């Protein structure tokens, strides 16, 4: 068994707790949505590899420049992730998380993570985002970001649907087993 | 961690943990903001268990096995003794106003009303002052000592063989020194995020949100602090490298 880690970043408003909660937990959040994540120890078998994958979260650490850079110490992988009822959270990714992931973190895989992508179909979604001339990240500006940032690879789920966590996860442990 | 508090908080909620017929008396409001107050309580009973298992059973255990510098041991486990006596101490006035509020006849129904005015008292004065310092120098030694760490397991078998041993079993799974070096240090930024959450469900009371008003501004404060007190040191790192 191999020991890797991960770590997400990314604005709040991304879902990156729920991620991790929804990606670590064989149930789902039926009756309660935990606030915060402690660690979890994930056992992964991606393409015949068994890999022990520590997932790590920085919700909370946002505001503290000093505290934040503490969790990136040995990291094997990164999620980068953004909401795509959220234009802002993906605007902010080459101007405030790319610059210090890069800077901590050189050579580490990024994977640019677009997180709730069950409400790019959504109508209250749309509503509220042409109130400020907005309208959901699109699947080719997404790319086209992960592109820009160099990141490894870009990717879509929904943690409330489940649908593409568990393809988000095992790609990252063929990220962090990389050269 | 003890029998009697593991059971106390082994559910998932705290709308799993009471019993059904007590938890059918209360509204949509409380169920929700108890839920929250249990999070917190569950996750700091948790947070005194990691530092456990740092204290006990490796910086003890490695005093006992291993015969390495006793400076080694305060390198890889720095102010966990402090540390360890101020979430005690909170645990514990944590667990007594929930079992204050329990019903009679009963040892898992309860709601807690008052949460703003322990959590006013534990982030301010003496005991502010003692957790910012704390933190500050944990901090800004957590590096040298995953460095120390790795140092260590990378050139000495005897330490090697200790750290396959102690951490064999199941239970410590999260819980290896690093994971819980940076599980403590990760601990004081999850408190405004509960703390936001609980007085988003308790406008009940108008005494009550205004304490969560001010515990929450004083646990910012708090984070400010040590934030701004943090220099991350290098073993060996030579006197040129820090005044430049
Ligand atoms: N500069 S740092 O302490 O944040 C650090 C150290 C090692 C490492 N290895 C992989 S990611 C990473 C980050």
């Known amino acids: 068994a191999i020991r890797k880690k991960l770590v997400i970043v990314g604005d709040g408003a991304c879902g990156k707790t729920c991620l991790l909660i929804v990606f670590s937990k064989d149930q789902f959040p039926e009756v309660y949505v935990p606030t915060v994540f402690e660690n979890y120890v994930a056992d992964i078998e991606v393409d015949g590899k068994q890999v022990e994958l520590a997932l790590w979260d920085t919700a909370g650490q946002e505001d503290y420049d000093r505290l934040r850079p503490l969790s990136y110490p040995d990291t094997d992988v990164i999620l980068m992730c953004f909401s795509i009822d959220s234009p802002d959270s993906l605007e902010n990714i080459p101007e405030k998380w790319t610059p210090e992931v890069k800077h901590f973190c050189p ?73 | 961690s003890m029998e009697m508090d593991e059971k106390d908080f082994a559910a998932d909620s705290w709308s799993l943990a009471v019993d ?40 003890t255990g490695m005093l006992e096995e291993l015969h390495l510098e006793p400076g080694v041991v305060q390198g890889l486990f ?49 005991s502010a002052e003692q957790m910012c310092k704390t933190y500050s120098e944990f901090c800004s030694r957590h590096s040298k000592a995953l460095k120390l760490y790795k140092e260590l397991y990378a050139r000495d078998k005897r330490f090697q063989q200790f750290i396959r041993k102690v951490t064999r079993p199941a239970v410590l799974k999260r819980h290896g020194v690093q994971e819980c070096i940076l599980l403590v240090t990760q601990r004081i930024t999850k408190y405004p995020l509960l703390i936001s959450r609980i007085l988003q469900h308790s406008h009940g009371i108008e005494e009550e949100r205004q304490d969560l008003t001010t515990a929450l501004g004083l646990v910012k404060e708090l984070l400010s602090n040590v934030d701004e007190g943090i220099y991350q040191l290098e073993k060996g790192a030579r006197l040129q490298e820090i005044y430049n």
């Open chain 2, 78 to 126: 720095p102010c966990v003794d402090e540390l360890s006596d101020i979430h005690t101490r909170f645990l514990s006035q944590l667990l007594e106003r929930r079992r204050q509020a329990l019903c009679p006849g009963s040892t898992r129904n309860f709601v807690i009303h008052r949460l703003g005015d322990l959590l006013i008292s534990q982030f301010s004065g003496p």
């Open chain 2, 20 to 59: 059904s017929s007590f938890l059918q008396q209360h509204k949509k409001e409380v169920m929700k903001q108890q839920d929250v107050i249990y999070e917190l309580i569950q996750t700091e009973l948790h947070h005194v268990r990691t530092l456990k298992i740092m204290t006990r059973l490796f910086r």
């Open chain 1, 107 to 179: 050579n580490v895989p990024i994977i640019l993570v677009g997180n709730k992508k069950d409400l790019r179909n959504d109508e209250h979604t749309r509503r509220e985002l042409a109130k400020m001339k907005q309208e959901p990240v699109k699947p080719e500006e997404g790319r086209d970001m992960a592109n820009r940032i160099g990141a490894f690879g870009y990717m879509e789920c929904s943690a409330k649907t489940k649908d593409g966590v568990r393809e988000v996860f095992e790609m990252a442990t063929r990220a962090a087993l990389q050269a």
